[PDB]
Amino acid sequence: TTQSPLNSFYATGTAQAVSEPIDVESHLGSITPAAGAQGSDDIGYAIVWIKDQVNDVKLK
């Protein structure tokens, strides 16, 4: 009568990667010496947000 191939069974899921691993927002400052002067000053900072299940980051 009917001979089934016994293959018509399926299960399906989805995957996505919609975000980059890091986000960088800058809060740097300024360097204001006189002409030819020597000095040092703190510039500011830069926030590096870490995204989903990211544990170690290697940057350049």
Instruction: Give residues in contact with a second copy (CB under 8 A).
Output: 1-4, 14, 40, 56-58
| Alpha-carbon gap, residue 43 to 57, rounded angstroms | 23
Using CB under 5 A as the binding rule, whether residue 2 contacts Ca ion is answered as no
Between 1 and 32, whose beta carbon lies closer to a second copy?
1
Instruction: Count the residues of the shown chain that bind Ca ion, applying the rule CB under 5 A.
Output: 6
HEC assignment per residue over 31-43 = CCCCCCCCCCCCC
Using CB under 5 A as the binding rule, whether residue 40 contacts Ca ion is answered as no
| Binding residues vs Ca ion (CB under 5 A) | 36-39, 53, 55
